[PDB]
Amino acid sequence: XXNXXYX
Amino acid sequence: XXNXXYX
Ligand SMILES: *[C@@H]1O[C@H](CO)[C@@H](O)[C@H](O)[C@H]1O[C@@H]1O[C@@H](C)[C@H](O)[C@@H](O)[C@H]1O
Ligand SMILES: *[C@@H]1O[C@H](CO)[C@@H](O)[C@H](O)[C@H]1O[C@@H]1O[C@@H](C)[C@H](O)[C@@H](O)[C@H]1O
Ligand SMILES: *[C@H]1C[C@](C)(N)[C@@H](O)[C@H](C)O1
Ligand SMILES: *[C@H]1C[C@](C)(N)[C@@H](O)[C@H](C)O1
């Protein structure tokens, strides 16, 4: 991962 | 709020 979210 | 990130 590395970005975040939440989708 | 309620969503996420990160910016
Ligand atoms: C990120 O979000 C997931 C759920 O989707 C959760 O299981 C992780 O523990 C969470 O990561 C933590 O919080 C983020 C802000 C930090 O960058 C990460 O190192 C971790 O402590
Ligand atoms: C962000 O949300 C995930 C999923 O609930 C959780 O695992 C992380 O602990 C949470 O990160 C915290 O809250 C955000 C808003 C802050 O930017 C981050 O540093 C951390 O405190
Ligand atoms: C993260 C938060 C959110 C965008 N409100 C939710 O719909 C998702 C499943 O998780
Ligand atoms: C959340 C994760 C990220 C997109 N890699 C970072 O650049 C931001 C400051 O925090």
Q: Assess contact for B3 and A4: CB atoms under 8 A.
A: no
- d(C-alpha B1, C-alpha A2), whole Å: 21
3-state SS assignment for residue B5: strand
- d(C-alpha B1, C-alpha A5), whole Å: 13
Ligand 1 centroid to B6 CA: how many Å? 11
- Structure determined by: X-ray
Beta bridge mates, B5: A5
Q: What ligand 4 atom has the least distance to the C-alpha of A2? A: 5
Asked whether A2 lines ligand 4 (CB < 6 A), one says yes
Q: Which residues of A touch B6 (CB under 8 A)?
A: 3-4
Tokens representing B5 are 């990130």
Q: Assess contact for B5 and A1: CB atoms under 8 A.
A: no
Nearest one of B5, B1, B7 to A7, comparing CA atoms: B5
Q: Which residues contact A1 (CB under 8 A, 6 or more apart)?
A: none
Residue with the two structure tokens 């975040």:
A4
- d(C-alpha B6, C-alpha A2), whole Å: 9
Q: What sign results for the dihedral spanned by CA atoms A7, B3, B6, B7? A: positive
